[PDB]
Write a protein that binds this DNA or RNA. Structure first.
Ligand SMILES: Nc1ncnc2c1ncn2[C@@H]1O[C@H](COP(=O)(O)OP(=O)(O)O)[C@@H](O)[C@H]1O
Ligand code: ALF
Ligand SMILES: [Mg+2]
Length: 436
DNA sequence: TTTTT
């Protein structure tokens, strides 16, 4: 059963007709477990989404993009080219028209344009433009001290800056129309058997520099990444590639390389997986795209069973089933202000065809937000770059003995967004309503 | 840098 404070938030959300709620609290407080209780209460009437594939699977839902069929690009504000309602007889329209509750987990990683598109898509599909989210009761769960939304430095950043003032979900203009009720969780459930670890992460969350010095003196163990049962977390994908290639060297399978087809402008830093992707049987991998048939999803973990020319078999950890993987296509979209109109336009400039597979003995910290891991080693690589990155990497485990780091961390590496300090301040009053 | 399709 749930804890005292989780059940209090359960009743606060289900016993009132208010249409917008946020359940928020530190890492491991039980938000997604409370989400489980909400799914069973609501059962068929609620849709569960999340921004990332790993979080969606952790929430037992799907990604926001794949539910609304949003394209993987900047969703311009109420733009018909970007937010397209489903057809008159489509299965998705029936789902949107009948839906009564939308549950959105890991809302801290939902960018502001994504949240605004969900609002507008629901209003347009349900034919209710006057009501926020088209009259659906939205239940948001997440932590703004965890990872900030991903914002590439194109004209996207300028456009998000001009339209909303920043990238976070609480900067959406829909909060000018409806008040967001905030309910808070405080007790760590993940670190419940290790109360001094839980208190260390609390002080780390407040930015305590003695908690960092305590962490460094206790958790810095360079060889910790080679111990069995250990998931390695890195800030960057290229850093995970070099660590994965080391564990792959030790596998006795005969290797096979999967050669990507690249066309047009598509630079290597933008590749979702290596262009010369080499794999062996038994290798640990994560899948990067959703199956059109529904057998696997972006974020599924599993191991390689068979490797053939343009097809391989993967044994999924999620359900112990065997799925066959084929090449997918990724587009590279860029935005130009050309030339002196008052708008920017997206354009496809390159494509990347490759198996949607990547080795997963080491993952990015982004792909780990939401997970409880048995043992983690943080490889700092060339350093942290994202608000909340460090805190997510440290809060995945239940006990301090389950956590190691490749090097000590200086306090000058801690990042803080002032947008999150005003938000965290105002929502202590139990309410968030956006001004102006 | 990172995510989404
Ligand atoms: N009431 C509870 N009793 C026992 N274990 C719990 C409870 N709530 C959560 N957990 C466990 O604690 C861990 C973290 O909970 P989770 O819901 O994933 O927190 P969050 O979503 O805030 O990170 C998971 O292993 C979960 O199963
Ligand atoms: F939702 Al979390 F750690 F905050 F899984
Ligand atoms: Mg969670």
């Amino acid at each position: 059963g749930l804890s005292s404070e989780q059940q209090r938030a359960f009743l606060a959300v289900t016993q009132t007709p208010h249409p917008a709620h946020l359940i928020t609290g530190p890492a491991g407080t039980g938000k997604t477990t409370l989400l489980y209780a909400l799914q069973e209460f609501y059962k068929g009437r609620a849709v569960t989404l999340a921004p990332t594939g790993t979080a969606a699977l952790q929430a037992r839902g799907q990604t926001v993009h794949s539910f609304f069929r949003f394209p993987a690009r900047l969703l311009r504000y109420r733009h018909p080219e970007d937010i397209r309602p489903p057809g008159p007889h489509s299965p998705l329209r029936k789902a949107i028209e009948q839906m009564e509750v939308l549950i959105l987990d890991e809302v801290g990683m939902v960018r502001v344009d994504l949240l605004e598109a969900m609002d507008w898509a629901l209003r347009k599909t349900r034919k209710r433009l006057e009501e926020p989210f088209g009259g659906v009761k939205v239940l948001l769960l997440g932590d703004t001290r965890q990872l900030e939304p991903v914002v590439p430095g194109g004209e996207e950043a300028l456009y998000i800056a001009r339209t909303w003032g920043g990238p976070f979900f609480f900067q959406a203009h829909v909060w000018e129309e409806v008040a967001l009720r905030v309910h808070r969780l405080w007790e760590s459930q993940r670190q419940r058997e290790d109360p001094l670890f839980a208190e260390l992460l609390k002080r780390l969350r407040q930015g305590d520099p003695q908690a960092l010095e305590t962490l460094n003196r206790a958790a810095v163990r360079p060889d910790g990444g080679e111990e069995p049962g250990t998931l390695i977390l890195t800030p960057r994908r290229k850093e995970a590639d070099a660590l994965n290639l080391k564990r792959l060297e030790a596998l006795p399978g005969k290797p096979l390389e999967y050669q990507a087809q690249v066309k047009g402008e598509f630079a290597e830093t933008d590749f979702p997986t290596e262009a010369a992707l080499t794999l062996k049987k038994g290798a640990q991998v994560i899948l990067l795209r959703n199956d059109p048939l529904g057998e696997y999803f972006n974020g599924d973990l599993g191991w390689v069973e068979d490797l053939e020319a343009e097809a391989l078999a993967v044994r999924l950890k999620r359900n112990g089933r065997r799925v066959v993987i084929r090449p997918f296509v990724w587009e590279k979209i860029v935005y130009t202000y050309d030339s002196e109109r008052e708008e920017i336009k997206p354009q496809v400039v390159g494509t990347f065809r490759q198996v949607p597979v990547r080795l997963a003995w080491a993952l990015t910290v982004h792909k780990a937000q939401g997970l409880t891991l048995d043992k983690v080693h943080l490889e700092l690589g060339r350093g942290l770059f994202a608000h909340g990155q460090l805190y997510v990497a440290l809060t995945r485990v239940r006990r301090l003995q389950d956590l190691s780091l490749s090097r000590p961390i200086a306090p000058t590496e801690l990042l803080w967004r002032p947008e999150v300090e005003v938000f965290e301040t105002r929502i202590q009053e139990g309410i968030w309503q956006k001004s102006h």
